[model samples]
Target chain A: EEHANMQLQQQAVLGLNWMQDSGEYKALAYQAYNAAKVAFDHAKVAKGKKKAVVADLNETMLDNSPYAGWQVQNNKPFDGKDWTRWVDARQSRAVPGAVEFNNYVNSHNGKVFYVTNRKDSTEKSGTIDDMKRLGFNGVEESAFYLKKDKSAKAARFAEIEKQGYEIVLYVGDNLDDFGNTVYGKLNADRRAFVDQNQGKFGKTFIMLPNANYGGWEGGLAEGYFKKDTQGQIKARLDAVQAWDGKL
Target chain B: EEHANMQLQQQAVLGLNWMQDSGEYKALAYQAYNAAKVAFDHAKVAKGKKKAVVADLNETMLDNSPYAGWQVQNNKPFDGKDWTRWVDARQSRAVPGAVEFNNYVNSHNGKVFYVTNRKDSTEKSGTIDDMKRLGFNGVEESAFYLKKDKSAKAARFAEIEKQGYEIVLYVGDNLDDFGNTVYGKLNADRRAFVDQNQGKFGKTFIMLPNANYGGWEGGLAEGYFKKDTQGQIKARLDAVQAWDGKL
Candidate 1:
């Protein structure tokens, strides 16, 4: 099953490239950007109050496909140390349209806040530097919320709200980026939460495309890391609810 | 979400090629075949009765990666019409080591039974012809349990057991290929059942690698088909119990 996992990763890397080259990736980013603009325009805030477009950092504004692609080419699973090294290198590029979208929000008197689960100890400084290098504007040290606890982000989001910034739009690749309703929940509960908030999608909550790596993969595996690669593969296989259709 | 689905399918098709060329595909098939041979050698059965090796057709014994490859290349979903055409062509290859293992069982006076869910109406005749062309020996019409119903295979399996033929081994890519114990069950129930029968894997039940397509995809979607591809993709994304790990 490790072989299966490796194969899947390889294909995902290839898919990422295909999406980028075919302009499909850009299309999705622009879609999210358009939605954010619409939401920002419609939002009503107090005269003296600020409005914010809060987004997850990695894969939403910044593209980490290079790291994922490197792993696939090297036949390696994700390692925290390796990830930190990559982040320290400050090599990530901006996702198409992300910087422009944020600039548009800023021009309209809205602030951009990045609420990421990147660990404060190893990832925060590198992430900030990478964002700066990628030409993202209006990203101050105070605008970034580095994660202390990995599972919960509601408190960080609330921290933004307490700053008198009305959260006008949310963006991320994972559901938890919006709030805690589906955060750290089981598959079934997550599904129910999505269903409950179906109307918010594309309006208040914009999701980015990230198939190579995300919480979705961990969700499918029921956990992100496992001692046995083969066991993890089997666990992922068992997790799927297959169609009755046969070959 | 439809874009997500398309990306996954494209990656799967690419993965199928990579596995075949890398020889990893052969390794897994041979592993199952060798295990079946060892299990058959150790088993004891009644002298007056028959013993049988029951296997799911696609990916277990026959390699239908070609069908999947075609679908991905054409950007088409699994259509019964196209599938029927492929079956009628009788061009599928044998999974590596499958024929040799089955021949060994036959030499020991054991029978090979293909308990497939390929529909009886559109798939039966072509499936039989395909098996025969692939050099699978002793395959009668009765040996092929073409699916009359999609969700249950226990009755078909029981039909074989009632014939006084002790099922010595079972092989498949899907859990439902074994019996009703896991068939059409929720993902959690299926996992629990696999855990309960942990000892049976490899010794009595041999699972082949099939990442490209299967019931698992449907399970992820929670249903096989949707009028809207985006809806189906959303269902699949929702079904994942993601880890809190960040990029």
Candidate 2:
């Protein structure tokens, strides 16, 4: 309900640093915010029609502060292996826009697709309870998708597709949230991949921002970072068509 | 059962990628895996009596591959946002070591906690059905735990902590699995702030591995990933007082 919590701000700030430093993060953040904005706007025009939006579960829809805090207490940074431990504890908080947007979607009969990367063996009951705590829309334990389903996302798209959503908005903080592909790639490759799907922007994709870590950061070594920030300023000074003394 | 399926190997490879790419991700993966392992091994023999081991629902006992596959398919990584769509629509494979280990714990009179992160909301019933389908251990739908009550981990630990639990294996994939702490800085600070509690290491905190994503990746930029892979390797080489200048 409240958006300006101190801890949340810190996480967001930390996230911003990562996003600014990496293109993939920037792209994701851009997409999430963009898609939500678009979806909300689209819903406004549909008269009485409902619109739907989808989001990846962790880090995107729910702030992982609870789990992260646990890691800090444990002298650990937080990794995949401890996920079950964390989920078992059920300490996740709703991400910034999650509740508000979910509520909005619910009001219009539009649903939110909560796609996650968590495995299915973690005891579906507890996980569902956690989601309900977060106040997601149209949640059914069976409705939750897991990695085992080969076509989870497409299947989700198909479900939303079935609902006859005139404007389907997809939001996530990861590239895979938008496309079907492998993770942990270098930066340039990630950008190229996003570019390949450029057509989806405004049409189907709206990514959120996640800067903590991603493939885009890996690409910094390859040089895409050189184009977006202070590095660009440095590069501009280094190159000269002919060093014409403008001074 | 299917060791040759390379599930662990794949997760390890993914984990390595996360460690190499994102500090937070690395920590999360490492912590989660380590915790589960500790829990499992701890349950083997702690104190004088062997009690039942209880685990959280998602990311603890079950592998959420259905969702992981979806992220890869959509070109996005996993985020904890909208999961009902994912869980309801797909089937998750058992997490590596989950079934085998849980059965082992259960056979020894160890009660499984099938604890979860789900909340009490309008959609609780449907979610419960999902759990029934998945075969979760003892489940308490609403009011699993209260903040007023002892911490989830402490509460469990208190009950079993005194029972002379030869081993109380608590498995999960997130930091919260052990207790209720948020991820990121708090998690980081805790690791540095707390004492080793070495005695508790292998006995109470068995963890499982998950490489798709976690808190380790988030810490990469926060003084953790201070040096890139090349720089770290170079530093390691420089540390070796060898006179030979091969470069």
Candidate 3:
């Protein structure tokens, strides 16, 4: 199982490294971008309401594939030092269609709010700088809602809504970016929540592709294994619900 | 991350499937077998005391690699229906050199006890059948100490000691199989317990290789994450302490 985990980690790193060239990756990103474009166009028709689009930062607007690739290539796990270095370096690029979509929304007189889990300290230090560097519209530091008390972005999303902006579209790679219904819920509950809100997937919530690292993987490791590498692998393996088909 | 988890499950299933021909697998088994042989030989010098060797059944004495392979191949998780089906099938083989070691111990006036986590009902139904079928010595149904209340093997190990048999060797893959010191403890606590008892690894306790599944994995999943798949994965990723190396 240890070997399995190592292999899987390597696969994730490789997948992210190659995502730029992968048609499927481009397709998923473009799908979300196109959906957001439609929603933004529709929101512009609303005369009285303030228009806004909310999005996650990492893997949603900013591409951190380089960090994932580096981790795999250098045989490092997702350590904070490397992560901080990566973030502070401000080298993250915009996802394929994200910059264009944000620009389009901005041109349509709509605000683009980045509701991210990046630390508040990172907002001024690196996150905002990176957003501006990557040509993300609405580059004000306040526009990037940095995580304060928790990992969930529901509160931040609500905060954005309270600011008199009609959040026409929500965009992220994780379910939590949509709301608390899927945030921190069990795997089944998350799936059920997604099912219940199936109609809103591409319309109200635009999900980008993120196969490298996310809350989904972290949840699999929760309470199922030890903190060790082997335990992590075993927990993931045991957590899978396999089909009963014969070989 | 979901893709990573799926790939990991496949790798574990495939590893078990190919374990029979893997030299590394054979070498580890032989290492444990050779160590047991030496321990049994040295135990002969003990004067006037009835000597015995206690062992875990699954992965220690009886090889259940097939069960793991079946899970991966069939896309089934570790549910009871398939587990009971596998156990009742009674196709488990002996670990390499285990039969010889057990027979030698029996011939040299040392008793062999199969202390396992297999349920008592499983003992009478198929565990004993599987053991006897695989040419294991001391095939009496009574020799197998089935798990009753918990996953810990301390009580079962104690029961063996109470039978007036001097337990010269304890064998299993998991830490809990050795004793309660490592059982049910958190990951850090288990690591500390193992560190404190570093001297006991190969001398008094002979650990077999079992990466596919075990209590260690289950312990990791306990109370840390929500019951859902995404929640479990998220918990594990959060628990990881990554290195601070520069990428």
DockQ, every prediction: 0.02, 0.01, 0.01
Error of 2 at B224 (Å): 20
- TM-score of chain B taken alone, candidate 2: 0.53
What TM-score goes with each of the models? 0.52, 0.37, 0.50
Tell me how many residue pairs clash in candidate 1. Answer: 11
- Per-residue lDDT, model 2, residue A149, is 52
Taken over the whole model, the C-alpha lDDT of each candidate is: 0.66, 0.45, 0.63
Q: lDDT tens digits, residues A97-169, model 3?
A: 7888888888878888888877776445787777778887778777778877888888887787777888888
- Chain B TM-score in each of the candidates: 0.88, 0.53, 0.86
CAPRI grade of model 3: incorrect
Segments in model 2 whose C-alpha atoms lie over 4 Å from true places: A1-37, A43-51, A72-81, A149-152, A159-167, A181-185, A197-203, A213-247, B1-247
Report the CAPRI category for model 1: incorrect
Candidate 3 Cα deviation (angstroms), residue A213? 22
Ten contiguous residues minimizing lDDT sum, candidate 1 chain B: B18-27
Error of 3 at B240 (Å): 4.8
Candidate 1 residues lying further than 4 Å off, grouped into runs, are A1-8, A46-48, A221-224, A240-247, B1-247
Query: Sort by TM-score, best first: what order?
Result: 1, 3, 2
The sequence of per-residue lDDT tens digits that candidate 2 reaches over residues B1-247 is 2332222112222222322233233222233333344345434554467565656556555545445444322323233343545544435445434554555555546656554554334334544565555565444453132123333455554555455653355555444565544344423343432223223322354433333333333333353335543442232222222112111
